[PDB]
Amino acid sequence: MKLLVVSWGDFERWKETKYRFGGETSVGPSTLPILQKVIKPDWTVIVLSDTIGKDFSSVETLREDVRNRVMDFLDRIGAGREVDVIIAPGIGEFTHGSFRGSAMDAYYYVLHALSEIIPTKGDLEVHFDSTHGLNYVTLLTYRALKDLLGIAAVMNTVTFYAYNSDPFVPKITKELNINTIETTMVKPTPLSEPLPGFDEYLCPYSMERAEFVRLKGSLNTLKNLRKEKKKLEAWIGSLLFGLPLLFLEEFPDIGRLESYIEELAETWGGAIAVNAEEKAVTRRLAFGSGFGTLVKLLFQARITRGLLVEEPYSIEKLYSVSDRLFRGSTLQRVRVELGKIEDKAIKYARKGAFPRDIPLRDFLGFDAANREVSPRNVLAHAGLEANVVEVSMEAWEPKRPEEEAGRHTHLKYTPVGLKKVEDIVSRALKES
């Protein structure tokens, strides 16, 4: 899939010029038509500041005024139907309006918007144009794109191209080349940050601190996160540290995460005060790092949801998950650890033995007086620590036990074991 993303300011102020790109030429006020003609994207995203808004009735008449004039402009130079328009929250004191709030809301808002548009299946070829952007909006859009594509690159091949045309200079320009300023194959970067303290999801920008403590207390999201924060951190660590059984057992509820993000999003939006006479927008809540982490966490869950196999969790199924999820020395460590359990299962199968509901330590034949569950042993053994895992072999009539044993040998954490592993992985994620 080919995706095109452009950063736009006040598109109406741009002058007609001609652009050169990929053995093609084009005349008009923006690069988008020639970019679309050479690149041939399957989808186009335009990121705009809402600070080009003029009619201050309230929030919906602002996003409307901007979307009207943008859709006007896309018709004017024929940018086609396959378009999404992200109206990001800008800030500043302009000729027709005043916009106050955290600068960083534009990052979290664009991050959130892109997380709903970027395909979570198949390979991604991403094309980014920085020609026309506000400095800060273009930079936060670039960062938001790279953060999400890094997560996408966990499961899929991801290539990223950035463009910037020659500088338009009004009195001397004849034509502007579209220069490739970046070409990069995107490195797989799993989410590597804990969920923060319940202060850093929504933050008061210009809200009295007594009013904040009130609304924070009313958010069901923060109370639900209280329970699940450690379980969600355990899942993040599963991808980062190569713990395939924990990846399955802690796989997050995509529906629940959607609902957490939506409530934080509509709470932020609801705290935007518009003064039609003063022509002033004040975003009294700011998004915190915690909103970003939830958006990245939901995106990673969507990217990897295909790997959530039906129970029970056989060695064969854990190999299949591991082979998709892990790379380099992490994959090879995980395969060696599963192989040790598999070789034991084969030995058992050959003797017509099928242990059910047996601690992994008893399955492998361990000596007594080492029942302490250490970070070292959880992290060094792909989370398959001998004191926290229960093995079951579903009895069968073996013909080729070396082929069969992997399918009939199932692993899970004991209820006590899972809590110990959660504490260890959560802690290891925080120390980082």
Ligand X SMILES: Nc1ncnc2c1ncn2[C@@H]1O[C@H](CO)[C@@H](OP(=O)(O)OC[C@@H]2O[C@H](n3cnc4c(N)ncnc43)[C@H]3OP(=O)(O)O[C@H]32)[C@H]1O
Ligand Y SMILES: Nc1ncnc2c1ncn2[C@@H]1O[C@H](CO)[C@H]2OP(=O)(O)O[C@H]21
Query: Is position 29 an interface residue for ligand X (rule: CB under 6 A)?
Result: yes
Return the range that interacts with ligand Y (CB under 6 A); candidates 90-98, 106-114, 351-359, 381-389: 381-389
Query: Is position 279 an interface residue for ligand X (rule: CB under 6 A)?
Result: no
- State which of residues 167, 217, 255, 365 lies at the interface with ligand X (CB under 6 A): 167
10 binds, among ligand X, ligand Y, its own copies, none (CB under 5 to 8 A by kind): ligand X
15 binds, among ligand Y, its own copies, ligand X, none (CB under 5 to 8 A by kind): ligand X
Gyration radius of the chain over CA positions: 26
Report the distance separating Cα 241 and Cα 259, nearest Å: 28
Query: Is position 188 an interface residue for ligand X (rule: CB under 6 A)?
Result: no
Query: Is position 10 an interface residue for ligand X (rule: CB under 6 A)?
Result: yes
**360, 363, 364, 367: CA torsion to nearest 10:** 90
Query: Is position 7 an interface residue for ligand X (rule: CB under 6 A)?
Result: no
- State which of residues 384, 391, 418, 424 lies at the interface with ligand Y (CB under 6 A): 384
Task: Pick out residues in 30-89 that bind ligand Y (CB under 6 A).
Answer: none
Query: Is position 25 an interface residue for ligand X (rule: CB under 6 A)?
Result: no
- State which of residues 364, 404, 414, 423 lies at the interface with ligand Y (CB under 6 A): 364
Give the shortest CB-82-to-its own copies separation in angstroms: 25
Return the range that interacts with ligand X (CB under 6 A); candidates 45-53, 329-337, 363-371, 411-419: 45-53
Q: Footprint of ligand X on this chain (CB under 6 A)?
A: 9-10, 13-15, 17, 29, 49, 51-52, 90, 94, 131-132, 134-135, 165, 167-168, 176
